[PDB]
Amino acid sequence: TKGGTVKAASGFNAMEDAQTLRKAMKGLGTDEDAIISVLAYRNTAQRQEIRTAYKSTIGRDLIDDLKSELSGNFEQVIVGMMTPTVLYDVQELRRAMKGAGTDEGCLIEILASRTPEEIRRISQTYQQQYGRSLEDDIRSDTSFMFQRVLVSLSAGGRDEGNYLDDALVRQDAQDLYEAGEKKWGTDEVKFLTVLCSRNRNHLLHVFDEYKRISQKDIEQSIKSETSGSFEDALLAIVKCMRNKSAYFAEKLYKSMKGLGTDDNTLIRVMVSRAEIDMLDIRAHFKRLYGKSLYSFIKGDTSGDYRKVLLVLCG
């Protein structure tokens, strides 16, 4: 509805930007403000043109220079901003799975929120970059019903388009109701099949019908009937089908509220959504939590890290 905070700059000069960035980094010390004033006011495509211009105008490599000059969370945001869109998702997935230990929250967030077309691009880029299957890595790094959900999302077999069959809607809702009657533990395969196979229009109709027949939101039933990462994956699917901007508002809230900060999630959401739907995310955040997103970031971060996140917020 409202769209991104970061837009293409109108008077963009890639050579001038390269000069500005080199001046900011040349010699002892850094003008971090100058780096933000350029990069946070260009879109991801424009940033790639600056990388090309920096090689031809400065005789140096921009990402290499920024990695050398910057540290910590600030470095992570800036390098992430500089990364092509699809590759950034690819790299986040790889980081989530590399070594023993698995960032399951990252896997859920990307695989439930991207469209099947985006997931296909991510899957192909991952394969090209690493010589590894995305699906095979997911299979190794997750288990049981959670694994099945993530493999399905990554394999891109969900029905597409918006064809609406009322009889099938009714059947799917009835099947989910029946799965909730069990005296023994839900029928988890049915949640898997419905939530991973059906098109969005169909699912929105199933959610409505499910509330009509059960008197509960499907989210409430998911929370009562399932647990662990599987529960989290099913909720993320439902939330992203209903309104992805709201889902991301919740993720930002969770990343900052309470004891500790999940900087990896904060950074990834702010970088990956700034150009897409940040104004909508802001609106939902305010409706949900009665505070501005800006003020959360302001109150929970500091330094140049805070400064760049606040520009990405608008």
Q: Binding of Ca ion at residue 38 (CB under 5 A)?
A: no
Q: How many residues bind Ca ion (CB under 5 A)?
A: 1
Looking at the Cβ atoms of 62 and 194, the one nearer to Ca ion is 62
Q: Whole-number minimum distance, CB 51 to Ca ion, in Å?
A: 18
For residue 40, the minimal CB distance to Ca ion (Å) is 19
Instruction: Give the residue with the Cβ less far from Ca ion, 38 or 269.
Output: 38
Q: How far is the CB of 35 from Ca ion (least distance, A)?
A: 11
Closer residue to Ca ion in complex, CB, 65/175? 65
Measured CA to CA, the distance from residue 266 to residue 258 in angstroms comes to 14
Q: After which residues is the chain broken (C to N over 2.5 A)?
A: none
CA distance 239 to 248: 9
126: number of Cβ within 10 Å:
23
- How many whole angstroms separate alpha carbon 113 and alpha carbon 252? 14
E strand segments, 82-157: none
State how far the Cα of 151 lies from the Cα of 34, in Å rounded to an integer: 43
Q: How many residues does the chain have?
A: 314
Closer to Ca ion at the Cβ: 30 or 147? 30
| Closer by beta carbon to Ca ion, 22 or else 139 | 22
- Rounded Cα distance, 194 and 176, in Å: 9
Rank residues 79 and 155 by Cβ distance to Ca ion and give the closer one: 79
According to DSSP, residue 277 is labeled T
* Interaction residues for Ca ion, span 161-200 (CB under 5 A): none
- Give the nearest distance from C-beta 24 to Ca ion in angstroms: 8
Please state, in angstroms and rounded to a whole number, the distance separating the CA atoms of residues 285 and 249.
5
Shortest approach of Ca ion to residue 22 CB, angstroms? 10
Site for Ca ion in 9-28 (CB under 5 A): 25
Binding track over 128-167 against Ca ion, x by CB under 5 A: ----------------------------------------
Which residue has its beta carbon closest to Ca ion? 25
Residues 58-77 that bind Ca ion (CB under 5 A): none
Quick one: 27 or 258, whose CB is closer to Ca ion? Answer: 27
CA gap 312, 274 in Å, rounded: 6
Which of 66, 26, 73 lies closest to 50, judged by CA? 66
The Cα–Cα gap between 229 and 111 comes to 13
Instruction: Provide, rounded to whole angstroms, the least separation between the CB of residue 26 and Ca ion.
Output: 6
User: Nearest to residue 222, comparing CAs of 205, 243, 212, 237?
Assistant: 237
Least separation, in Å, of the C-beta of 14 and Ca ion?
Answer: 21
- Applying CB under 5 A, the residues found at the interface with Ca ion are 25
